[PDB]
């Protein structure tokens, strides 16, 4: 029954603690991605406001002229 149980405990701590570390590095890649995502969000929103403003600008220009 025993004998083998002694060695088996070691590996199911090592392999399953390297998992712990493997996890904390994933949560850190996660928060860095959420961060980067929100930046693109505000980037795009700043872009579309500028775009709409320029679309409106050309509209007014052609009317003032044609």
């Amino acid at each position, epitope marked *: 029954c025993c004998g083998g149980i002694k060695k088996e405990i070691e590996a199911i701590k090592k392999e399953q603690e390297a998992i712990k570390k493997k996890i904390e590095a994933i949560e850190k890649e996660l928060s860095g991605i959420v961060q980067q995502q929100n930046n693109l969000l505000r980037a795009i*929103e700043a872009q*579309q*406001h*500028l*775009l*709409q*403003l320029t679309v*409106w*600008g050309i*509209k*007014q*220009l052609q*009317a*003032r002229i044609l």
Partner: antibody
Amino acid sequence: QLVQSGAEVKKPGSSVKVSCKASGGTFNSYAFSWVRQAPGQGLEWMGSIIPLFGFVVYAQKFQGRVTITADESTSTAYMELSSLRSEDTAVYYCARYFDTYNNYGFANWGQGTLVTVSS
Amino acid sequence: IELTQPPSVSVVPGQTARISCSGDNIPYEYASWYQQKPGQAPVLVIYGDNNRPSGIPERFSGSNSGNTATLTISGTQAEDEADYYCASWDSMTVDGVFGGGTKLTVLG
């Protein structure tokens, strides 16, 4: 946000410049328009400037007499009506729009400017 | 382009009020509704589709069918008595154009 210059009295034939200093954000992402309201009547859209591009569109009843200008260094848009007659006696509003991208409505208004044309 | 409003509209409190805005081609999202109590500057209440600026009561609704836009007010209160204007932009000249205005008179 918006605050315009004080009330004024102009002799028939004179000119008048109305200021409107905006505050609370990037001035180049603004769109402006000048709306006036004669005593007792409705609103009348006169012109519209986009400070970023530095030119104006005018309602054709006002073409020639009215001049609109912004000033990014002072965060202020200007309205100037020339060759004044008593039918120009009204409260003149500074009105900004494009609060958001799809908002074509005038979101913010100034307090108004009572211009009285009298000899 | 032009916009026609009824000069005056009157309704009993608690019941809904409808103000029509008739014009040829009133683009789509270019439309707006404003509220103007006596000695004040107008207040944007609805813009474009059916959007209330954050701060405007949920009883204000915006609608469009054919050539007519319509501001709707569910359960009209006595403090809604004011001059209501509609406005838009010309799709051709990019001219801003206001309606004549509608005096809302809450009865009772």
